C-alpha cells in the first residue's frame, strides 16, 4: 500500500509530503502510517492506492480522503497526545495520556476536564490542573471494570477571550481488554 499527502497551510501554500509505502499486516489487517504536518496546517487531502505489483495500475484499487483542523473561531485548541496504539489497555492499568490546551488565552485556563463513556453512558468524570511548568496533569486514572467492552474519552475546557468565550474539546477512542469484574 502507498500514500500521497497534499497538506494545505494557514495561507495559500500547498505542500506535499514525500510518497510513503508499507504492507498491510498478516494478523491485524492494518497498513499503518504516521504523517508529520506543517505547524500552520488547515487541511490535508490524502490519497491511498494499493501498490501490489500484480495490479495493472489503472485497475489498482485506490481511495481518497480529506482531514480537517478543529476549526476554533477563537483559534484555541485542545490536543489529546495519543498515538492511536492498536493494543488494548489491560484491566486496572493506569491510563497514560497527556493533554495540551494549545491556546492564545492559556492564562485563563486553570484546568481542563474529561468524561469517559462506556457503552452509552458516562461512567467517569473529572478535572486536571495547570502546573507551575505550564503543562497540565495527565489522564492517569486506572481502567476500571465499567470500561471493559470498549470506552471513549472526551476532554474539554471553556476559555474567555476579552468578550467572546468558546467550548474547546477533543475525544479519543480507548480500546480496553475483554476481561470481566466477576472474573468468572
Amino acid at each position: 500500500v502507498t500514500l500521497n499527502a497534499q497538506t494545505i497551510d494557514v495561507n495559500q501554500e500547498t505542500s506535499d509530503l514525500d510518497p510513503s509505502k508499507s504492507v498491510t499486516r498478516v494478523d491485524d489487517g492494518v497498513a499503518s502510517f504516521v504523517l508529520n504536518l506543517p505547524s500552520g496546517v488547515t487541511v490535508l487531502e490524502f490519497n491511498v492506492k494499493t501498490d501490489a505489483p500484480d495490479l495493472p495500475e489503472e485497475n489498482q484499487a485506490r481511495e481518497g480522503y480529506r482531514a480537517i483542523a478543529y476549526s476554533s473561531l477563537s483559534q484555541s485548541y485542545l490536543y489529546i497526545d495519543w498515538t492511536d496504539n492498536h493494543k488494548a489497555l489491560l484491566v486496572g492499568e493506569h491510563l497514560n495520556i497527556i493533554v495540551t490546551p494549545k491556546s492564545p488565552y492559556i492564562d485563563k485556563i486553570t484546568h481542563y476536564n474529561y468524561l469517559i463513556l462506556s457503552k452509552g453512558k458516562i461512567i467517569h468524570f473529572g478535572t486536571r490542573e495547570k502546573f507551575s511548568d505550564a503543562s497540565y496533569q495527565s489522564i492517569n486514572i486506572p481502567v476500571t471494570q465499567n470500561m471493559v467492552p470498549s470506552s471513549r474519552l472526551l476532554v474539554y475546557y471553556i476559555v474567555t477571550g476579552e468578550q467572546t468565550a468558546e467550548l474547546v474539546s477533543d475525544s479519543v477512542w480507548l480500546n480496553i481488554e475483554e476481561k470481566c469484574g466477576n472474573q468468572l
Binding site: 480537517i68 478543529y70 476549526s71 476554533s72 489529546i80 492511536d84 468524561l115 463513556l117 452509552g120 458516562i122 470498549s150 471513549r152 472526551l154 474539554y156 471553556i158 467572546t164 468565550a165 468558546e166 467550548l167 474547546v168 474539546s169 477533543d170 475525544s171 479519543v172 477512542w173
Partner: protein
C-alpha cells in the same frame, strides 16, 4: 460514531455520543448523523 475528534466543538461531543447545554456559544441541535458505518 467514529474514532474521535470533530469538525468543531459541538461536533466533538456529537460524534462522541454526548449532547450538551451551554451558554458558551455552541449547540449540537445543528447536527445529525447518518446510519453509522465507521468501523473502528
Amino acid at each position: 460514531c467514529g474514532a474521535g475528534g470533530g469538525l468543531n466543538n459541538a461536533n466533538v461531543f456529537h460524534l462522541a455520543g454526548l449532547t450538551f447545554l451551554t451558554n458558551a456559544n455552541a449547540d449540537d441541535s445543528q447536527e445529525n448523523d447518518e446510519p453509522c458505518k465507521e468501523i473502528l
